[PDB]
Amino acid sequence: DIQMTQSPSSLSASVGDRVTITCRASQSIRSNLNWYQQKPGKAPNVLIYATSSLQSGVPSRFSGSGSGTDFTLTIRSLQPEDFATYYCQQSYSLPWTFGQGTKVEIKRTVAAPSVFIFPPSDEQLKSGTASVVCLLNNFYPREAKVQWKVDNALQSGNSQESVTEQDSKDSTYSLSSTLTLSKADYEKHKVYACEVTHQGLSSPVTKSFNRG
Amino acid sequence: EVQLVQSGAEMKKPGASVKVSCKTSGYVFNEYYIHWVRQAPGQGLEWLGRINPNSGDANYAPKFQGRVTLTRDTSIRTYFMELNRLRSDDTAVYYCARIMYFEYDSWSDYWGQGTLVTVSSAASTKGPSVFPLAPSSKSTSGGTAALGCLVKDYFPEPVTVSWNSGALTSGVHTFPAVLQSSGLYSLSSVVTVPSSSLGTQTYICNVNHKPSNTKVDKRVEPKS
Amino acid sequence: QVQLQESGPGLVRPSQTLSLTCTVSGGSITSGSFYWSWVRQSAGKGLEWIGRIFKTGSTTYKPSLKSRVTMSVDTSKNQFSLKLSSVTATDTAVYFCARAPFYNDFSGYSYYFDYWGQGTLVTVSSAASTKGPSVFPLAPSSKSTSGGTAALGCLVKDYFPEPVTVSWNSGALTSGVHTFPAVLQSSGLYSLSSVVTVPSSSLGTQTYICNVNHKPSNTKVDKRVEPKSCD
Amino acid sequence: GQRLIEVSVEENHPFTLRAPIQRIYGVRYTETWSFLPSLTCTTKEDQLAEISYRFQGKKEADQPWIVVNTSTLFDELELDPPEIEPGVLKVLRTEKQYLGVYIWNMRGSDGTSTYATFLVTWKGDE
Amino acid sequence: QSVLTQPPSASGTPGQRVTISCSGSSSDIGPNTVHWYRQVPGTAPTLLIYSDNQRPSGVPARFSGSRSGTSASLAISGLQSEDEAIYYCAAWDDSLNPLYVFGTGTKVTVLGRTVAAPSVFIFPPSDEQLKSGTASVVCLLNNFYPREAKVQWKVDNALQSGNSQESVTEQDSKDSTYSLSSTLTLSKADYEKHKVYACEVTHQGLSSPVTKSFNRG
């Protein structure tokens, strides 16, 4: 087997910037190296084959070069749609081995989150469980804090967050913090709030509602 | 239009055998190889094998030799992969792809959609429970308004959520699942829409869970 | 683009020699792996293979006919030719020329006819002699007059040997044209009818002509069908 | 290549050897034909011709190819050389010097190799 | 001299899979390949299958062929009105006396088509043929299915016999409807006896016989 190493493993770069990923092979694979682009929730997509040949439809900012052991993929003008993981694959000898992948994240102007709060649904409240959802809509950078406060009591161990992958148009992230309480516990307290701190917020934003 | 369509997601118990299908269309079936790749959860790509439509002959990777079998049915234009002696390490998304050749160069032009195989000791695919994330910001939703659907508890993955049967594609954020203490999964899909359309346009989330063969549609409306 | 055409049909008296030739278009017979061959079909007796020739002159004949069948080729004029001797009445058939690919594979010897030619009815009969056909007008009337169409035609009555071709308005009329198969009359002469369905709104507003081609007697007859005097 | 493909040819009659296979689009293929005149005898074989091509698979567009090499064996005997095409070998006038074993080999960019052996004799003369 | 044995006729409704067989020896089909041809009446045969399974360009994939030992077969899957023709198989006999053996012939008839009722037309005798001393009355059935019909020449309510001949077209390529012509050649001496002549047609699509008569005019 030909062990294929990819470097860097993850790069952060801005729009309109030259980006070069590298693939190295344990032996010489001649021109038999292809480059693939996996976008979230989708199958890998080929961009360059034969070490330099561009695939039909694929943008012209993608270029390939190299020979034998070392090869390089170059994106001249980064665009927000290029957020993906990039893999290199040898077409020389079977078994065909792939690279480890390189994730390209797009550095962007600081964007503030739009915080929304969702009280539990009576349909869910009729099952003994209450889920309270706090949503941060479109922000950059990814780093953000969501502190839950039930009757002004700082909560912990009862929350669960989930962050989306970078948008291919806004290069922004979204977060969903879920506070899961028992129905009885939810019906004991009245004030529920999620407090959000982010690089784009000069003061912490606190969304809130009253019920229970 | 080369189109490859694979079978649905499956849950299998350790030691079982999984057979994934791949129906191809839009090209000369007997003029292109088809190969199988696997992407583990959170990891990269791995080669299982390749099969020639004509000779019915296959080439397998060293790791999977003896554990994987690739077959074809040229009459129905369908390729099959079978993994035996399933183990927890075998949980992954399995892909079937066409190989285009130029001289000695090979690549995968058109890919399948993916089939998630989950090797778990659980015995029943528990369908999702959908609850409404109602769009009522105290009846003062200035500017945009957020509405959603909370998929409460489901096993295994995945769950596909769309809005308005697929018409609503702008501003839809379906967050990644979070494994819960129950051993079950959970997710939430939100969308930011104009406040003017709140009382005028119906908003239905379509939640599909193939492993349990459960599809649920749910209308979300401001509480009143 | 590959076209094959035979010499014309005609009467051959029994126990004399039949000669036919086929000309090829769209190429030359000097291309490789192609046998130029003759087969025949007598009505009721299915398909029978007469023989094949190559560009080199190597031939293969049907064994039942080897004593009497001879084949020749001409790469200069792209023409292959057949000669059948001591002919009997049972040799009356449609003689087709054809091109045949041939090759040996793991399955065996493959030899098929892909590009055929049309046919020529060679009649071996001392029962009659060649005769120009007489054409008579099957005139129209107000048939299906409760909201329908009408019909009109030509009646070829006394011709030998076969075949004969009937066209309408020099090929302009092809819709509804139903030329009928020939029947042998007790005179020893063939007869047939060619009819056409026309709209009733075209009887007195359109001219109708039939064109009869009897190649064996070098005869062509054109007849103008017109509505009867009262109609 | 299962076993010997026997070919019974008539005297001075053409013979066409055919090796049928379905190729893969874009793969580069190379074919060689070798003739052992063992029938008229009274890893060294006579490579008749070596050809190569790339499969376009349009099923209609006649495929171009390359005549890599051709031996001069049949010219030393003042006989015409065979017509070699992808998958086929043609002889226009079979003669004693054309009888014997023909070996067809095809190697492809996809890592495939195929063989085929023919034994050309005469019917009625063996 | 040899023959390849074939079923005299096969049939099926539109959409069925029809099989035609071809039985041979160990000198034909056995050692050599089988090829299948299609013949539409009035026109030359056309190649359908070569090298036991291989289809010419323009031959639909619903036509298939196979060979096992001394026998071969053809499959018309998805039988259609266009597939109604005579089908022949053929193979090479490489005996010491070689030849190309053909088949007996198999005629596929597409059943279950629209039962079309004939249109009857009675043409009275022509000019210049009456002058020739012979009268000819033509009864024409222009478009019908099936081929089975019957025309009776009633002359003054008396049935005629032995003096009429019939001709039938093969199914038209466009609509596959037969056409029939019953010519009654009764000589002038008897034709001048009256002007009353009728042809009566009985066909499956007719609820009752259709009579077309000529008198006076």
Residue numbers in the entry:
A (entry chain L): 1 to 106, 106A, 107 to 211
B (entry chain H): 1 to 52, 52A, 53 to 82, 82A, 82B, 82C, 83 to 103, 104D, ...
C (entry chain B): 1 to 231
D (entry chain A): 138 to 179, 212 to 295
E (entry chain C): 1 to 217
In the authors' words:
Glycoprotein E (gE) is indispensable for viral replication and cell-to-cell spread and is the primary target for anti-VZV antibodies. VZV gE is a type I membrane protein, is the most abundant viral glycoprotein expressed on the surface of VZV-infected cells, and has also been shown to be the primary target for antibodies (Abs) elicited after ZVL vaccination. Critical for many VZV gE functions, as well as for VZV neurovirulence, is the formation of a non-covalent heterodimer with glycoprotein I (gI), an interaction that is conserved among gE homologues. Results: The 3D structures resolve distinct central and C-terminal antigenic domains, presenting an array of diverse conformational epitopes.
